[PDB]
Design a protein around this nucleic acid. Structure first.
Ligand code: 3HE
Ligand code: ZN
Lengths: 292, 144, 159, 103
RNA sequence: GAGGUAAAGCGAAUGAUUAGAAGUCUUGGGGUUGAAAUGACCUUAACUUAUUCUCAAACUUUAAAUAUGUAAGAAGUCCUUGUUGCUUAAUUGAACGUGGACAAUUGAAUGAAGAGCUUUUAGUGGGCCAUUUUUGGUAAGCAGAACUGGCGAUGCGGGAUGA
RNA sequence: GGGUAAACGGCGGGAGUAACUAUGACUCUCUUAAGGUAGCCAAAUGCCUCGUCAUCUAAUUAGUGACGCGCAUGAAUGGAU
RNA sequence: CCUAAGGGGGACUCAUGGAGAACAGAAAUCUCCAGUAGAACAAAAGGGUAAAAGUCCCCUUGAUUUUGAUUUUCAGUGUGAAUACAAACCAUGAAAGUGUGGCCUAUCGAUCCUUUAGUCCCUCGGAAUUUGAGGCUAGAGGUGCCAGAAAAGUUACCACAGGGAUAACUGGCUUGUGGCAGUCAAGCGUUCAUAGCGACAUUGCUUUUUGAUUCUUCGAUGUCGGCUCUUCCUAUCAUACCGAAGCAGAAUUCGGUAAGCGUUGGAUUGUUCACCCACUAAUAGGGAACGUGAGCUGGGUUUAGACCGUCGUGAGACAGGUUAGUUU
RNA sequence: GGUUGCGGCCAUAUCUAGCAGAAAGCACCGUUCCCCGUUCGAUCAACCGUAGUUAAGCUGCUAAGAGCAAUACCGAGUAGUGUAGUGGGAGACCAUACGCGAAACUAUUGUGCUGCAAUCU
């Protein structure tokens, strides 16, 4: 009764969006605003702290843009944290803080800016920016890139932001998005931010649930139960993790049980292969012949 | 008009030698409705240079009445005689540009025997303009 | 009522290409322009700031100034019996590098590479480009290629 | 058009030289003085005989005047003048628009 | 490099448009079914599907020819390293340089009664015609444009005679 | 605010309606300062127009007598004799 | 036109269709699916725009200050508009960034004078003080004929300088319109396309209509009609000789060669034109500078007098009527 | 080679209908103390990675698939066009000479490639 819409004319004139826009992964408006560099700073690249949150992982990369494609400067993953003493809650706000601190220290060691720009040593929850040292190299400057993730006060991305800023990277920001910011009284509560930095919210949840709903405690905080980790000593886990990260931030790749060629050969087994033109011509001939 | 001025054809019945390349071929194509060109034989070149050969010496048209005149102006290009110049023209040599530019544009007379009935149409259609390819020699014999 | 506004007659010149509307690929914003570069001007309709006048659409010039988001291009325009240097400010979305440089810059390096070798080998080499010369003599063999005789065909109506 | 009663713009004052609060009000041209040299000159050229000695404009074409805003800085009392475009209607501090309401 | 005119296209968007065919009418009526069932049947009209004929100065995916921009070196390329309050995380750059190498094929053709620069002043500011492109008009030795060439300002040979 | 037109001057439209039709005494309607009265007229003033009828002639865009919604007649800008 | 319809940020996706839900139906609201923009973006049209430039929400005043550079129109002058920066000061955002009015292309204005703001500075010249005045920098008050005089008619009593750069005749180009002639053949014609006609179409000619144009003439080519007189054309009204018929005769109609020869007298009108009466073989049509004014006439038009109607406050107008008006 | 993150070119990558997917990753998935946001913890926020699943997303393959792209003894040296003639023709227009040269149509082929970092039976 109505005009069939998906006509050949509809397909012919359709302008497909950008590949990574149809994937729903890249916002090219924000990408244009971030990447584009002041033309009089000819080949000096802008550096993006790309922060991404999966269901199980945190990725924090430092990226500069080029025509052939983006080039990774340094990278830090949440699944690196077990090496530094954090095994559980790898997607906490505090795990995000640890990842940010790790990427900051790793990048600074790669550059050579370790003696200068050590960062906020005594994590207190105060808002503070990496201040340049007079008569010395300016701090590494990085701009946060949250992609399609929504900006809400208390979001985990700004945990990575805070960790990187405390690690010595100069990442410009305002403290009105940290958990602990009072909009009505426009100041940042340092104690609540400090609580969130050292897993205080997770510890409070364990305390509250343990003495109220113990079965949900057994199901949710199982890994802490088998680890004999109480609510009170969680803060020291993150405190030791911070010191360990600041002691040695270098990258240790995981030992791989197979070579690249072995992986390629193993994976190529489960891949269907395209037919020959002759094969599909034979298929068409067979179908016609069996149609009579 | 500009093309004809660059070929130094500034008067009627004026002749010049051109080395064929893509650039000069495209130049000549623009001037085709006004010129007759062809592939000259050796005897045609010799008769032209002997009877009507003049050199450009200090922007002056000087008759080639002695080999000293040719030498004084083309010795740095190893042209020591009228025969050297004719050979450089015929077998287009390394110094063709200098030798051909040294030659003043030849000033032929009207043909003895006339043209065809109507000139300003292509030689294929019974005119005289364009490329005639070996009949340039008969025309030059009429004209020199 | 004659109308001679700024963008008069740009109905097709300032249109986007078919199936090329929308956002600009970021290779445009990543290219680096230096003072003295040769660039082509092509107005992009989707960016109305820093847009050239319709005269400069399709003209080539020299970058002389580089600012935050723009370049200053120099164009020679015929005004009467002489040229006038025009200084146009263009956002880099309307500007592209001229490809005529690279082919010549390649020949500059290629010529030097060939020339220095000829000195090394104790010979000489001629570097000037040459127009396509008339072709030399050749022999056409006819094994399997006995000439086909073609004749004009009779007239025939084909409706 | 509608303009608010206040505005925070740049102040030219030597001790302000920054954005400060301003009280916006409309500009009214003052009355022509009788002792201005031009008036004082024109009143003698008109005396005696000769009639009307200067042009009197009649071919009016505009229907609107540019509205000038006289911005009073609240700190150093320095005035400023801002011209607007030509508008047939102009009020200061009117009712702000209500978007999404019925007729 | 740029272009959207000629051409082309319309079983490609917009708009215009000829003809049937097969379907849906369940959200068209008529007639005939029914003691009352909107549930059919014959019909025209609507739409839908695949086709079909013909178009567009102010339609278009495509898209010439001619005309048009730039480059084809010594004020160039390359190697090394000096200045800055600009720029970079930086010893990064950017701009301008010092010093060193690359000579007559110093980097396409052809031509050049030479190139460049300045002052000052005359007349003119009614134009017209031809080819080609083209608008209004039935048309015009009509009105108005585009490119070139002419007449005006020019005789001479031809068109008998004729800007 | 009053007076003054032998001061300058001005002096309207639309519908239906009478035991055929035609017309409209009549009615309704908008509107003016007032709505052209008595008279006169295709007049030296009427376009249409060589108006229609009669008379004058063999034949008359002429003449005269009538008729009259009169482009655009009319009362001391005097009307009719 | 807009304190948002400006600026920043965020979230969302539009027109429409389909399938469904009490009242509810073609149109209310709700839900899902499709939906490349077929919506919207103040106002013309064009361009542009989809995690937006569109819809909604939060915060705002960058629609701010200083003076330069550049683009368009261009003389590379002004005005308008726009662009990119510099030095400030701010808004917004986590931030990169963005913002010097409106997504872009239109939306506007010198000198003189006045006025306001700024600087509180310079001057009033014999020396001061205070009022007043005059300066310096930026706005506003306006010129739409928009590079910007302050401006009602009429001349039929007219003047001058000019103009064929320009109208009112002829002529010339054209032939729409006018006129005349073909081709085809659906029909008409008792049947019958074509004796005689001939629709719908289509091809021409003519310059006796009126146009269109403005080439010649404004240091003048005497511009209506009539009378008078000559000549020419043929597209032939009559007269000669013929062919055809829906030609029995008579009369008539169609056609050919034919311009030799003729084509009138009157009433009304200035008329050309027209319309009657009458005679006649017939009362055909045209040209010749719309033949013909040092041939006439002067009724008309179109000087100056005068009257009327309508129009105008008026002087006056009328391509309306009327009467009188030097023809070398 | 598979996968993830960030990309470059922006359909050879899109669209429709099917089928398959070991490891890992991604994902769907669970909960509401806390930060936060809603008519609604659906979206958004936080927490667990613990209870489950490859059903979907995602990836690959299939289709005389639509579309798109490329190529051509395809159409066609056609249409058109620059230049020329005291060429033809009443004209409208056309042919020829020296040059340049399409689009549709037809047919065939193809159906993302790739950079940086990490990870994996
Ligand atoms: C109409 C009014 C006056 C007008 C202006 O003063 C008229 C003057 C101009 C001039 O230079 N000389 C004169 O004699 C007349 C102006 O400027 C407007 C804004 C305001
Ligand atoms: Zn102040």
């Amino acid at each position: 009764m109505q005009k069939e819409f998906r006509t050949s004319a509809y397909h012919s004139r359709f302008q497909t969006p950008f590949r990574r826009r149809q994937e729903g992964k890249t916002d090219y408006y924000q990408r244009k605003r971030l990447v584009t560099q002041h033309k009089a700073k000819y080949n000096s690249p802008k550096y993006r702290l790309v922060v991404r949150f999966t269901n199980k992982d945190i990725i924090a990369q430092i990226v500069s843009a080029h025509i052939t494609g983006d080039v990774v400067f340094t990278a830090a993953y949440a699944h690196e944290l077990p090496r530094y003493g954090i095994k559980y809650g790898l997607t906490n706000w505090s795990a995000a803080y640890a990842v940010g601190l790790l990427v900051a220290r790793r990048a600074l060691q790669k550059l050579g800016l370790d003696e200068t720009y050590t960062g906020v040593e005594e994590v207190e929850g105060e808002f503070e920016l990496t201040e340049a040292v007079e008569d010395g190299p300016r701090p590494f400057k990085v701009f946060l890139d949250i992609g399609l993730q929504r900006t809400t006060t208390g979001a985990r991305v700004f945990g990575v932001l805070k960790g990187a800023s405390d690690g010595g990277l100069y990442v410009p920001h305002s403290p009105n998005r940290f958990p602990g910011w009072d909009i009505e009284a426009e100041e940042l509560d340092a104690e609540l931010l400090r609580k969130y930095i050292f897993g205080g919210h997770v510890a409070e949840y364990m305390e509250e649930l343990l003495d109220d709903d113990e079965e949900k405690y057994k199901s949710i905080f199982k890994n802490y139960i088998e680890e004999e980790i109480e609510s009170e000593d969680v803060e020291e886990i993150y405190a030791n993790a911070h010191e360990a990260i600041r002691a040695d931030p270098s990258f240790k790749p995981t030992e791989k049980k197979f070579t690249k060629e072995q992986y390629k050969a193993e994976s190529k087994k489960y891949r269907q292969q395209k037919l020959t033109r002759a094969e599909r011509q034979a298929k068409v001939a067979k179908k016609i012949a069996e149609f009579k | 008009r500009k093309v004809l001025q660059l070929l130094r054809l500034t008067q009627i019945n004026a002749g010049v030698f051109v080395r064929l390349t893509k650039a000069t071929s495209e130049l000549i194509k623009l001037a085709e409705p006004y010129v007759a060109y062809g592939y000259p034989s050796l005897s045609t070149i010799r008769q032209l240079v002997y009877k009507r050969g003049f050199g450009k010496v200090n922007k002056q048209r000087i008759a080639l009445s002695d080999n000293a005149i040719i030498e004084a102006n083309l010795g740095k290009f190893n042209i020591l005689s009228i025969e050297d110049l004719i050979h450089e023209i015929y077998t287009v040599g390394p110094n063709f540009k200098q030798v051909s530019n040294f030659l003043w544009p030849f000033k032929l007379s009207n043909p003895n025997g006339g043209f065809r009935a109507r000139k300003f149409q292509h030689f294929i259609q019974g005119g005289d303009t364009g490329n005639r390819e070996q009949f340039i020699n008969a025309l030059v014999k009429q004209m020199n | 009522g004659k109308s001679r506004g700024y963008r008069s007659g740009t109905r097709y010149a300032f249109q986007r290409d078919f199936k090329k509307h929308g956002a600009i690929p970021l290779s445009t914003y990543l290219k680096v322009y230096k003072v003295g570069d040769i660039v082509d001007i092509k107005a992009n309709g989707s960016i109305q700031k820093g847009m050239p006048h319709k005269y400069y659409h399709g003209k080539t010039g020299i970058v002389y100034n580089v600012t935050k988001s723009s370049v200053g291009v120099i164009i020679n325009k015929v005004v009467g019996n002489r040229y006038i240097e025009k200084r146009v400010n263009l956002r880099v979305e309307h500007v592209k590098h001229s490809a005529c440089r690279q082919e010549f810059l390649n020949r500059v390096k290629s010529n030097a590479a060939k020339k220095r070798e000829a000195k090394a080998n104790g010979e000489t080499v001629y570097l000037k480009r040459q127009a396509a010369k008339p072709r030399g003599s050749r022999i056409i063999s006819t094994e399997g290629n006995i000439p086909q005789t073609l004749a004009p065909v009779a007239y025939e109506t084909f409706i | 058009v509608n303009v608010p009663k206040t505005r925070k713009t740049y102040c030219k004052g030597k001790e302000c030289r920054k954005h400060t609060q301003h009280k916006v009000t409309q500009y009214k041209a003052g009355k022509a003085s009788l002792f201005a040299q031009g008036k004082r000159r024109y009143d003698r050229k008109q005396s005696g005989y000769g009639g009307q000695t200067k042009q009197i404009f009649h071919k009016k074409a505009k229907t609107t005047k540019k509205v000038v805003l006289r911005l009073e800085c609240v700190v150093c009392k320095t005035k400023a003048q801002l011209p607007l475009k030509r508008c047939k209607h102009f009020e200061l501090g009117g009712d702000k628009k209500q978007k999404g309401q019925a007729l």
